Amino acid sequence: MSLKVNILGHEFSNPFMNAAGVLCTTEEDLRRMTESESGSLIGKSCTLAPRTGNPEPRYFGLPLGSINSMGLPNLGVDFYLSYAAQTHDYSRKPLFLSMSGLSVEESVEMVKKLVPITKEKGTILELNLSAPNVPGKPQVGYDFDTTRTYLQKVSEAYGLPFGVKMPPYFDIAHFDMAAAVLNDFPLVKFITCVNSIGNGLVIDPANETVVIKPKQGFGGLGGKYVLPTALANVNAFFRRCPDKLVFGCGGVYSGEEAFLHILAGASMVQVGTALHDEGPIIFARLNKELQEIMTNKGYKTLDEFRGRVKTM
Amino acid sequence: MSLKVNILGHEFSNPFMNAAGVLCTTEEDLRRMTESESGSLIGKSCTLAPRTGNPEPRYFGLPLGSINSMGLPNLGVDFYLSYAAQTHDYSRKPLFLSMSGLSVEESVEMVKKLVPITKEKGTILELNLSAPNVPGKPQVGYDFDTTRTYLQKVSEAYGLPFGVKMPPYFDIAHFDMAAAVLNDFPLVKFITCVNSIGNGLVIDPANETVVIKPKQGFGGLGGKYVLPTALANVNAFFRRCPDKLVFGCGGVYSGEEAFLHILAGASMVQVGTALHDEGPIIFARLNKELQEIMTNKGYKTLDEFRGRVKTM
Ligand SMILES: Cc1cc2c(cc1C)N(C[C@H](O)[C@H](O)[C@H](O)COP(=O)(O)O)c1[nH]c(=O)[nH]c(=O)c1N2
Numbered sequence: 001m002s003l004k005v006n007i008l009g010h011e012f013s014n015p016f017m018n019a020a021g022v023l024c025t026t027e028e029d030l031r032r033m034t035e036s037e038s039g040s041l042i043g044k045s046c047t048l049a050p051r052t053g054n055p056e057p058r059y060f061g062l063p064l065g066s067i068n069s070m071g072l073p074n075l076g077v078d079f080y081l082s083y084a085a086q087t088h089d090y091s092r093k094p095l096f097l098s099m100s101g102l103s104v105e106e107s108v109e110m111v112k113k114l115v116p117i118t119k120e121k122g123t124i125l126e127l128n129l130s131a132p133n134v135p136g137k138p139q140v141g142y143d144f145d146t147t148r149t150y151l152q153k154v155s156e157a158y159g160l161p162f163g164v165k166m167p168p169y170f171d172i173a174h175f176d177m178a179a180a181v182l183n184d185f186p187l188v189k190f191i192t193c194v195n196s197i198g199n200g201l202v203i204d205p206a207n208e209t210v211v212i213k214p215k216q217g218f219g220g221l222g223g224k225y226v227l228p229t230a231l232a233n234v235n236a237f238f239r240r241c242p243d244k245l246v247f248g249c250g251g252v253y254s255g256e257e258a259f260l261h262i263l264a265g266a267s268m269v270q271v272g273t274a275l276h277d278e279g280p281i282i283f284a285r286l287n288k289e290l291q292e293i294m295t296n297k298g299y300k301t302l303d304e305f306r307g308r309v310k311t312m
Numbered sequence: 313m314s315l316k317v318n319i320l321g322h323e324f325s326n327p328f329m330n331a332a333g334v335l336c337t338t339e340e341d342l343r344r345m346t347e348s349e350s351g352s353l354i355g356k357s358c359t360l361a362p363r364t365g366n367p368e369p370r371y372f373g374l375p376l377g378s379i380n381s382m383g384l385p386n387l388g389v390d391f392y393l394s395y396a397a398q399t400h401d402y403s404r405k406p407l408f409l410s411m412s413g414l415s416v417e418e419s420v421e422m423v424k425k426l427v428p429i430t431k432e433k434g435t436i437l438e439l440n441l442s443a444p445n446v447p448g449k450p451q452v453g454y455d456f457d458t459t460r461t462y463l464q465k466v467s468e469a470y471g472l473p474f475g476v477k478m479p480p481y482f483d484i485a486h487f488d489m490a491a492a493v494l495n496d497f498p499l500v501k502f503i504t505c506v507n508s509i510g511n512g513l514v515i516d517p518a519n520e521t522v523v524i525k526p527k528q529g530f531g532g533l534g535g536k537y538v539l540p541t542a543l544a545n546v547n548a549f550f551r552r553c554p555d556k557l558v559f560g561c562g563g564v565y566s567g568e569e570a571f572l573h574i575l576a577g578a579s580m581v582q583v584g585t586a587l588h589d590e591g592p593i594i595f596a597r598l599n600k601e602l603q604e605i606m607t608n609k610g611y612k613t614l615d616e617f618r619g620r621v622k623t624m
């Protein structure tokens with residue numbers, strides 16, 4: 001039996017990795033992800049210059065998941081590039097970097113710097129089009145003209161296969177419009193579905209006060225809240241973008257949710273809130289739990305069921 | 313303490329009503345809602361002609377809520393108008409009707425018929441701009457140009473105060489754009505936030521099959537999934553549309569969630585999934601639970617705390 005995944009030129013030991021933003025900001029974070037049983041890892045969504053992010057408190061664990069407004073705290077693109085070029089052990093697993101410049105001009109500068117490192121080391125780009133916690137910056141993925149500009153300019157500047165992290169969509173017309181843009185860019189080889197459900201609000205009834213400080217308490221939702229939305233997006237793009245891969249992100253706490261993502265079409269499965277809760281030991285648990293499910297169903301590889309969700 | 317709400321010159325006994333679509337399609341449904349302890353009730357979102365709706369199965373209760381793709385099954389506008397004009401006991405409580413024409417033309421034809429009944433009986437209109445389960449019909453509320461057209465034509469045709477049922481937004485810019493449209497229409501006196509989180513997907517791991525038949529398993533989510541989104545939408549429009557009321561809908565299972573909606577800015581509080589689960593006896597429970605919280609906090613009226621959520 002095998003959890004192996006063959007995509008983007010690499011053999012991943014298993015389909016699991018961190019969600020961008022969780023256990024991937026510092027060198028120590030990235031070391032712990034590399035030493036984990038995860039099939040891969042992705043660096044914190046970075047900007048050209050360092051950021052310290054939003055004021056505290058900016059993260060609140062919930063019974064059904066999490067709410068956060070981190071604000072893209074990151075050590076700056078030069079740090080992650082240096083990690084990718086010099087520090088990361090590629091013999092253990094492949095590396096993704098998430099880039100989340102706050103303008104197309106910023107993104108172009110950043111991805112240009114990555115080109116030589118991709119060529120030398122094989123580092124993979126995930127362009128973030130869904131940063132919901134940066135004050136005054138709308139989510140790029142909800143504006144299809146802006147999205148087109150970003151994809152055009154990054155395609156020109158980077159010129160190598162890359163992927164995108166998308167915000168969740170909730171309307172069939174939006175799935176259609178998003179896919180129409182994505183399908184115009186052959187260098188976009190994977191779509192990660194989904195980023196946090198943006199701009200939720202949690203209030204503590206006892207003190208009648210919001211639970212996070214930034215943006216009047218408005219923050220991105222993760223965890224159990226997002227699983228159905230995540231599965232829908234994965235499946236919608238799996239079907240609409242047949243010449244691209246889809247990665248699943250949202251609501252994964254166990255092998256069961258991982259199984260559902262893969263059934264829906266996911267090549268790789270990203271873990272955010274649950275990883276934040278449990279630490280990198282979760283990857284060992286997820287591998288065991290997914291294998292358990294496969295044993296019970298008589299599957300020997302992921303290829304036996306990936307994208308084979310049945311409809312009525 | 314007092315649970316009363318006083319709006320459009322009507323006294324409501326308490327802020328609770330059904331969410332459109334739940335316990336409100338047939339005469340019997342509406343009877344049970346009228347005989348309940350609810351402060352009000354709303355008719356099923358109707359169309360000019362009757363509809364039988366989407367194929368089965370089209371509803372599935374979930375641990376954390378519900379997924380559905382009902383497809384606007386309704387007895388047609390004439391049925392609901394006749395109910396409003398002849399059958400409903402207004403001495404018990406005020407009545408809302410939800411109207412959900414599939415085109416602006418259809419919507420206009422329907423609201424023209426309501427005019428004399430509103431004048432005679434006080435029946436209140438909620439115009440539905442978020443029907444996520446009609447195959448081939450995008451949610452109007454996610455197209456601000458289309459939304460503007462609907463509000464213009466309905467404002468002109470109806471010429472009386474009315475409300476709108478909005479889809480959930482997940483981006484600050486969308487809150488801004490939605491409010492900009494709504495604020496151009498003075499006859500829009502209330503905004504109901506929110507309809508289902510559209511186009512989620514639930515898969516059964518045992519048979520690897522989606523749980524509802526329509527639209528390859530894609531359906532609207534309600535229940536515990538939607539509470540943070542609902543509260544965010546309520547509060548965003550509470551602040552952005554001071555000339556209007558906001559009604560809360562989403563994730564209400566208890567007096568505690570009701571309290572949070574009102575704290576966020578809600579005038580009326582609608583109950584969907586929980587009512588579907590428990591039946592109209594829920595309204596007796598909700599009144600008691602809200603009364604308990606207000607007593608504990610020393611709030612004599614809802615007006616003492618409506619929209620008074622604290623930020624950091
Ligand atoms: C603390 C923290 C920080 C971030 C995030 C989340 C959390 C919890 N998320 C969103 C994340 O990648 C993921 O899409 C969501 O959390 C949904 O997955 P889960 O349901 O949490 O597994 C996120 N996404 C991204 O693309 N770049 C980032 O820098 C961050 N930052």
Ligand SMILES: Cc1cc2c(cc1C)N(C[C@H](O)[C@H](O)[C@H](O)COP(=O)(O)O)c1[nH]c(=O)[nH]c(=O)c1N2
Nearest residue numbers: 331332333357506507508534535562563583584585
């Ligand atoms: C079976 C069923 C049927 C419908 C709905 C829901 C459900 C469960 N909903 C959405 C509903 O009004 C409400 O906005 C959501 O269910 C969110 O509230 P809850 O979290 O379920 O309380 C709905 N909304 C609407 O405006 N008109 C309708 O006809 C329907 N139909």
Ligand SMILES: O=S([O-])[O-]
Nearest residue numbers: 069070071072133
């Ligand atoms: O870092 S996240 O908050 O965009």
Ligand SMILES: O=S([O-])[O-]
Nearest residue numbers: 381382383384445
């Ligand atoms: O009736 S609901 O499915 O729009």
